């Protein structure tokens, strides 16, 4: 009895183009994860190109996280005191243009949940962190990834 098919998708799909250098980044993440899992986008805010591109290429549960968003789909939670419950169960966690101060908080989250942390910094600006992350080049775009190792069984 009953129907649990409530199609609520109130969302203005405005995605800035010209993000060719971001395209490969999305594809890279897509290949690392895929459909039937969770991917967390930190620093979504007002730039949802990557996550949208990913969710269109693969029906992966893309979870957007940012403080006080204006877009339907972003988890309106907190990052200065993050809820691990949101990040747990994710296959990959990436951050779009992260400040060189909260990176440490992101690294421990990835390490906790067991997901690959991908940071897209500036072309000529460092993250100012410990030697943990690695510079990777995909297509033409370069970024920093971190493989959070899984706990022993």
UniProtKB/Swiss-Prot annotation:
It holds the Pfam family UPF0146. InterPro entries: SAM-dependent_MTases_sf, UPF0146. Belongs to the UPF0146 family. This is UPF0146 protein MTH_1000.
């Amino acid at each position: 009895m009953g129907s649990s098919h409530h199609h609520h998708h109130h969302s203005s799909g405005l995605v800035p183009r010209g993000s060719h250098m971001w395209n490969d980044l999305a594809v890279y993440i897509i290949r690392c994860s895929g459909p039937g899992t969770r991917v967390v986008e930190v620093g979504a805010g007002r730039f949802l190109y990557v996550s949208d591109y990913i969710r269109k290429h693969s029906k992966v549960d893309l979870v957007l996280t940012d403080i006080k968003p204006s877009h339907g789909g972003i988890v309106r939670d907190d990052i200065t005191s993050p809820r691990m419950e949101i990040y747990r169960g994710a296959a990959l966690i990436y951050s779009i243009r992260p400040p060189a101060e909260i990176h440490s908080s992101l690294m421990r989250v990835a390490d906790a949940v067991g997901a690959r942390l991908i940071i897209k910094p500036l072309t000529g600006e460092d993250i100012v962190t410990e030697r943990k992350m690695k510079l990777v080049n995909y297509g033409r775009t370069y970024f920093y990834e971190y493989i959070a190792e899984v706990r022993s069984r």
